[PDB]
Amino acid sequence: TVNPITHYIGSFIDEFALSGITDAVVCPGSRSTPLAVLCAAHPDISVHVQIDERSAGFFALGLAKAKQRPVLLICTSGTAAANFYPAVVEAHYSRVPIIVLTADRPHELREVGAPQAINQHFLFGNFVKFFTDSALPEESPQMLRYIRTLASRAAGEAQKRPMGPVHVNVPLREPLMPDLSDEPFGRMRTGRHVSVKTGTQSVDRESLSDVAEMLAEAEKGMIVCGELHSDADKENIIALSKALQYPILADPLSNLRNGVHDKSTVIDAYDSFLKDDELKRKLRPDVVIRFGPMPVSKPVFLWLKDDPTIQQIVIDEDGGWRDPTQASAHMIHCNASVFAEEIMAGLTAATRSSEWLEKWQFVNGRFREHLQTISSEDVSFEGNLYRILQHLVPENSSLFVGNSMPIRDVDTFFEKQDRPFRIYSNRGANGIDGVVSSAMGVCEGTKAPVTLVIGDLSFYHDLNGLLAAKKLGIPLTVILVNNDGGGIFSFLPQASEKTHFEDLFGTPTGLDFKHAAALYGGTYSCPASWDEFKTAYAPQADKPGLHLIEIKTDRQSRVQLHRDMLNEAVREVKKQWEL
Amino acid sequence: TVNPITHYIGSFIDEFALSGITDAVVCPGSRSTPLAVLCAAHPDISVHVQIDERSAGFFALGLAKAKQRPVLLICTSGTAAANFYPAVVEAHYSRVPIIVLTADRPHELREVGAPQAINQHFLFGNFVKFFTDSALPEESPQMLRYIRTLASRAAGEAQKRPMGPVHVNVPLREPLMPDLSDEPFGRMRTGRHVSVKTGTQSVDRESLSDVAEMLAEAEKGMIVCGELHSDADKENIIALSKALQYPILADPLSNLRNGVHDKSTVIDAYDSFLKDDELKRKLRPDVVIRFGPMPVSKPVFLWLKDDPTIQQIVIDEDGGWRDPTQASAHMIHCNASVFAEEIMAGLTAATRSSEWLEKWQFVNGRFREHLQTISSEDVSFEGNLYRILQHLVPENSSLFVGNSMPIRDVDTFFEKQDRPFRIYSNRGANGIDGVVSSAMGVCEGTKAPVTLVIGDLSFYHDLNGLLAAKKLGIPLTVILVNNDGGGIFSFLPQASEKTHFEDLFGTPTGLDFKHAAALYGGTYSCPASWDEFKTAYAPQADKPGLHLIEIKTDRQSRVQLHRDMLNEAVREVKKQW
Amino acid sequence: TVNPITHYIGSFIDEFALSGITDAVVCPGSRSTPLAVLCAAHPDISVHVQIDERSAGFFALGLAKAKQRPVLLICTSGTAAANFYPAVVEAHYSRVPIIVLTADRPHELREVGAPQAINQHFLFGNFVKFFTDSALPEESPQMLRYIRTLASRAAGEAQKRPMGPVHVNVPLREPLMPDLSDEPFGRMRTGRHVSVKTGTQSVDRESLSDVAEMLAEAEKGMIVCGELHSDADKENIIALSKALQYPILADPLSNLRNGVHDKSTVIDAYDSFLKDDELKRKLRPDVVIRFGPMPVSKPVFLWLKDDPTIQQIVIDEDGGWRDPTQASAHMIHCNASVFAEEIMAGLTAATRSSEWLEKWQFVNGRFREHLQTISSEDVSFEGNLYRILQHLVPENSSLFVGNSMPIRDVDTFFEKQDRPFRIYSNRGANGIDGVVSSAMGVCEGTKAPVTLVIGDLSFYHDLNGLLAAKKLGIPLTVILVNNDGGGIFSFLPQASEKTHFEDLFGTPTGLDFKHAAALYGGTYSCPASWDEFKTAYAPQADKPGLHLIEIKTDRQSRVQLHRDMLNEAVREVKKQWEL
Ligand SMILES: Cc1ncc(C[n+]2csc(CCOP(=O)(O)OP(=O)(O)O)c2C)c(N)n1
Ligand SMILES: Cc1ncc(C[n+]2csc(CCOP(=O)(O)OP(=O)(O)O)c2C)c(N)n1
Ligand SMILES: Cc1ncc(C[n+]2csc(CCOP(=O)(O)OP(=O)(O)O)c2C)c(N)n1
Ligand SMILES: [Mn+2]
Ligand SMILES: [Mn+2]
Ligand SMILES: [Mn+2]
Ligand code: NA
Ligand code: NA
Ligand code: NA
């Protein structure tokens, strides 16, 4: 008897391959037997095996995040699928295309207390934009058309704007092993069963009129740019700002701070200097153009929120609604490059004055220049790491930035610079979970060196993710910023309420992470100065190697030091202004 | 200028305490500040701080599994809550009561791209029997009544049969820090705002007629008994099987293989000998009574499923539907003790024939007796562990058993004995996830020694759960069964196909676990013999102390040796006959 | 002191008006007080009061279908909202924008057995693309920004492609009456709080290459056009068929059969003649281009489904996936006009051969000519009503076509003609529910005459929808095709199993509908010939006026007369073809 799984799943897997899927992250199980095996057999899909399904999730995340096209993510029936939940959520908010396949029992064994079986229908709720429970396998030509169409449709839904996770629950009946000598991947058509052509979203010159006029009329504007992934969008946003002569508050994930592009318009110190009331009044713009999601900067958020008379224009091609201020005045569902090209074409020919832009460049330059006069030697002040690391991230490598303080410190401390490198971070939901695995995935995805900057609780959180270093031979340099607990919470007003603060917020572990390096076969460094940090820090991607570089820092004293440093620089700016 | 959070959340947490909540498992975060601070400040609730929310969830699972009453599980907004999903699923199917509180942002900050904010409504779907999005804090008498009522209700729901997880999403608005010096816990009533009294379920004399008739008139019955947690139900199920003279196929989770109760009726080798067609025909029963969920034994499942003419009577007080054979003939939603007694009170004085019982005892005695003559010295054969460890587990302690082969090996090799101890396992959904933390929770829950028997892939899966040892000073003995990979898959007929087997199923980590022991401050042992295993093995609960005992075994040769051993004790049974 | 509801809900309703809402369909209730009163008081919103929520829902459906922009749909707490489900489902599949607002009890009165309170959270599941449970009313400036933003957002989501229903559940605390003397609609800005600019989707020249290339090369192509709304799209689809010389199988809902456009390419008898295997064999195309949802024609479906080697190109601007054949070869997520212009731009100037097209025009013309010769005098044969009615539908009016046989008969017997009028049908889910109220709403919507052709079970189903005639003074001409039961089931192979058929499928009512006309103050006709019909039939929209025109037909003999009549025409075609 032919087993219907051979050609049904064969066709399913083959069609994903035809769709451009080149990678599959697979977690072991018996029930998922045919999905796994057939991904392995298929010559166009590379299989990455991961034991911990939570890490597996964030690994696929990182992979897909790197290439901006989907990867398969496969597990067996039971709590295995439930473990994907954190990564699916992050993928949903970050708009990362993932195709989740979960094996399931057939109907006669569901909802009746069979071993390892759970309700997998709509498991991920609305975090996935497409869900289906595939038909029990069948061999008819009509059902093979159905299964290939399902695969294409799933891949198509993942890549369709609001890119995100999709979910196919795959019930499978016993005899699970596909017959690999019976052309399981056999096709009827020459190429793709169905090719899916998704498109760009545009808003025309005319409906854009209100916005063009307010931009034509406002000398005082600023562009706020969060996470960016498109080169074209970056070139065009930069061009747009020169045409308007508006400064760009550039979030680190925007990657406008680091590159050979023109940066005269780029402002990198705003998170610090905008905490001052007086500089805010001075730099208050009449109009704001936002690109991408909200920047990391809390002071930019508070600024737009607490001053709603500032007219915000929000550009989001995907047509979502990302504006926690409730104060934005225009929500524009337009490709960033189309939007910028249209505005530029509508402006008059006269080069605008750069006076307004100069105020910003003045405040920014004077801020950074004063910071330079303040010592960065002390490795135990957490801030200094970033003041040093910015200059050392090798050209064309990736920097994966942990949540909690590291993404805030990168924002605070990274100045604009001429060397290309990519900053990545899990900013859809800001989890400290699966960060190691995301960085691992990014590495698989880019095939270039990756540095991961990460706090100790986060590191601990995804210790399991280090398995990929050896098991998959994935090179990674981890900069572990270890202040033994949750350093971010020291910034809360409630940090003085000391009877509970340490138990419930500081939460130290006391862990010696050199044992984690050994566990996962990585090398270990614990530099006591930047000279020896520089000697230790050498990311690479030519061969396997896990390098843990641990920096011990003092969370109990960092807040006052941090604030004195910045306040002192802000104070200097105000003095220069008065000259 | 009062913060409404002070008394609103104060009243919320205080009421949980009034309901009998004594433990809160708490994961750090900003938005959950009042939840965590108030649990900490309240004199009746012990706080257990966990960093890894996935671990935290299984830690709470184990705590509530040990006590059969709800604990609080708390986290802040975002992917934190999503990390509770695996434990919530297991609690759902194991029927473990847990009250999940997830901090959220307020409305003006939801669904709008705010930092760390996710859609938390109905987060766990129907794995939870009760969900609500609680009101934004307000301090009026009416809303304080509402909030106290919600806590009790949440508590009551988790304990209402099918016990299980419940979820309250708690949106909170800045000023987050409650004012501790302003009587946050103040009430209007002397005790509980609302006391919830749930009850036992009963089916009456009449409705049990057809069933009590068939049992009376059937000589050839067996009782299948999986996981049980009731002392009364255990006694009565035994009483019952004496009155009828039916054998009891005791799943390890029934715990009927290890206690002071009478065990003449208890059968423990069935999973092994029922693999033979001939012994099955000899011992084919007319009627089967089931208590608890499905036993671990696949052969018992396949028996009832492939011989549908065997009449099954399934007893389930919770009214669930656990029977993947699709062939049971009576589903009875009645308390196990009430059912047993009603069946017994309707039996005549006609002292029952025990030949049928004796056929079972014969087969069990002969199986065990022959196996005993087989050498157990080789530490590298996985089965031997359980053959030795059975006699070593301290009295009044707990053995937590990992999924995959360990629960199966416990089934195969644990014989009935008089030494009392409890066996636990995550058999709701058989995950290899969070097993270490569940054992950790059981230890906290019982304040008695705990031994965890776990395979290597599962141990790696919840390495992070070991943090509880130093951070919470919970003692634990871990017997790490390391065969470097997924040993269970070797039993599959598809293990023969070699090109992919190892990659996709074997999946070795090659991890050296001594480094893990160092990481979490545990003492390490790697005994080459049962003598040094004995010296190393010393579970205790008086002080902190993590002990990792690694047994290296060979999965490549394990199956063939396992089958020989067993097929030989079966052959020997068929001859003694 | 002040009631929060006054400015909270006031700001909510005012912002909907600022969004473009001009109509609110409202159902009475106590808990929905502020919603209904404030809509009533607002100068830009017309309130339409419907008692039966199910009718209300379909009425809102027709109103929004007519104008292609959203309306408010409002009811109190409880089963009232559950009665919107059928309309919401139809709006979802038909892609009709509706903003559904449901009043609710406050938290302290929910899930605790309070009178009339049900769980309204996610009431409509995923039939709505946006749902929220709004905050309890508050008066703070931040919450008035939140609620105005919510109104904009709800409106924006209903109009955002795949247009459809959205749901806001509105919990309200008692004292419910807003203070109308305290400027409930007061703004913080001049004009819209946020303006939402949706755009259009385009695929660029380059990713259209393969499809353009195959279309330039395929002589034998066909365009299949289902429900259309855009005038630009019609013009461009027609232009494209001439550039390519492809016939357009024009579904009645394309409205390509009844307008001033060039119809030289329009094929109208395909549903009939494509039932024949030999004509199918002769007219088989290599490529198919689909616009709009699937047509009504079952024969076209089965054709495309059973010959998967016919290469289909489906254009769907909204990004959905409408193809029940599982056989399509390309899904293009692109504006139809844009797609059309791109293909035309890539075509050479060379004369396109018209022989292929002439085969189709020949078949169609011969079919229709032979049908001309078959008499239509018999008012008891249902087909005839449509052969007569097509020339009688007043120019610039609407024909709303009931589901079941009417839509099929319209497809069968409406030929192309130069007279303009619009045909509407609820083809989203094909329900026989709410058709009257839909019609009523199309009349409110177009401010022009509406004719409704509907079968008797359907007409019975929404008898309540006729209240809108008296109560709301809406004129409607109802052509009631009464065959006493489910006429359509006679085409089933199972109409022979007489032992259960009449009981389960025929389902006669015996109802004398003149009582219904009387109940609702309508005038009644029962024409015995087409002459009496031509005399009674006079759709208008200047005054109130409900006209019920009943046609009694015989479903027992219909099928054979129908099939004989069409097969006769088909056979004439083949004869003619041989000459
Ligand atoms: C999965 C998850 N759980 C909890 C949180 C709440 N949270 C935000 S920051 C933080 C502490 C992070 O500590 P660490 O990684 O050491 O960085 P640090 O604060 O020391 O810079 C926590 C627990 C979260 N963001 N994600
Ligand atoms: C969370 C989860 N992922 C995957 C599975 C599928 N599964 C069942 S047993 C097993 C292998 C476990 O290996 P180990 O703990 O070493 O036990 P062994 O098979 O060697 O006895 C797997 C992957 C599961 N049950 N749960
Ligand atoms: C709400 C609903 N219920 C049932 C159906 C199934 N259905 C399709 S046609 C039909 C019969 C309708 O009869 P009628 O309106 O008299 O038109 P006729 O069939 O006589 O052409 C039914 C019940 C449906 N489409 N919608
Ligand atoms: Mn830290
Ligand atoms: Mn193992
Ligand atoms: Mn009818
Ligand atoms: Na492969
Ligand atoms: Na406490
Ligand atoms: Na009005």
Numbering used by the authors:
A (entry chain D), C (entry chain A): 2 to 580
B (entry chain C): 2 to 578
Quote the authors verbatim.
Our interest centers on 2-succinyl-5-enolpyruvyl-6-hydroxy-3-cyclohexadiene-1-carboxylate (SEPHCHC) synthase (EC 2.2.1.9) called MenD, the enzyme that catalyzes the first committed step of the classical menaquinone biosynthetic route. Subsequent studies revealed that MenD is a monofunctional SEPHCHC synthase and the only enzyme known to catalyze addition of a ThDP intermediate to the β-carbon of a second substrate, in a Stetter-like reaction, which is a 1,4-conjugate addition of an aldehyde to a β-unsaturated compound. MenD shows the three-domain architecture typical of ThDP-dependent enzymes.21 Sequence and structural analyses place MenD in the pyruvate oxidase class of these enzymes, where domain I contains the cofactor pyrimidine-binding motif, domain III binds the diphosphate, and the central domain has variable, often ill-defined, function. Oligomerization is essential for the function of ThDP-dependent enzymes, with each active site formed from two subunits.
We now report the medium-resolution crystal structure of the B. subtilis enzyme (BsMenD), solved by targeting the anomalous dispersion signal from a selenomethionine (SeMet) derivative. BsMenD crystallizes in an orthorhombic system, space group P212121, with four polypeptide chains, labeled A to D in the asymmetric unit. The structure was solved by use of single-wavelength anomalous diffraction (SAD) methods and refined to 2.35 Å resolution. Size-exclusion chromatography indicated that BsMenD consists of a mixture of dimer and tetramer in solution, with the dimer being much more abundant. Dimerization is essential for formation of the cofactor binding and active site, with residues from domain I of subunit A and domain III from subunit B forming one site (and vice versa, leading to two active sites per dimer). A metal cation, assigned as Mn2+, is bound and helps to position the diphosphate group of ThDP and so tether one part of the cofactor to the protein. In BsMenD, the side chains of Asp457 and Asn484, the main-chain carbonyl of Gly486, a water molecule, and two oxygen atoms from the diphosphate group form an octahedral coordination sphere about the metal ion. Almost all ThDP-dependent enzymes have a glutamate interacting with N1′ of the pyrimidine; Glu54 fulfills this role in BsMenD. The active site is polar, primarily basic due to the presence of four arginine residues (32A, 106A, 409B, and 428B) and a lysine (299B). A hydrophobic patch is formed by Ile489B, Phe490B, and Leu493B.
